[PDB]
Amino acid sequence: RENLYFQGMRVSYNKLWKLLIDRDMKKGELREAVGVSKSTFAKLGKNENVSLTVLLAICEYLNCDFGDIIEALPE
Template identity: 55%
Template sequence: MIVSYKKLWKLLIDRDLMKKDLREQAGLTTNVIAKMGKNENVSTEVLCKICDTLGCEMDDIVDFIPNSEGESDKT
């Protein structure tokens, strides 16, 4: 399963926010933002903090995309 945070980055643009603003408002670390920038997995706790901060639902900020047939997970 591949994780994509494109929806989150678009939502930030639509709300005229920067990643730094999200980090500060949601109380996230720079490492978490960096992981998300690389479409890596983060905890559901992090996703819940983001949703609470932005007043949105999980499916508003993240997509879970099935791997193509024959591809293996990194983990």
């Protein structure tokens, strides 16, 4: 619906993977605790966008903030 004039950056979930290892957790543990669907969760592995609702739920469960799980990178 938006016609934005900046389209050159992409999400990265690298920090999330580092955090899970820091907590001794596997990605399926995160998926299942939070209730994220299989296809949405798969977007994380592909650095594809998910909703802020999903990201907020991950922050709530992990006791973290957005900058601990996502980064804006050049595409």
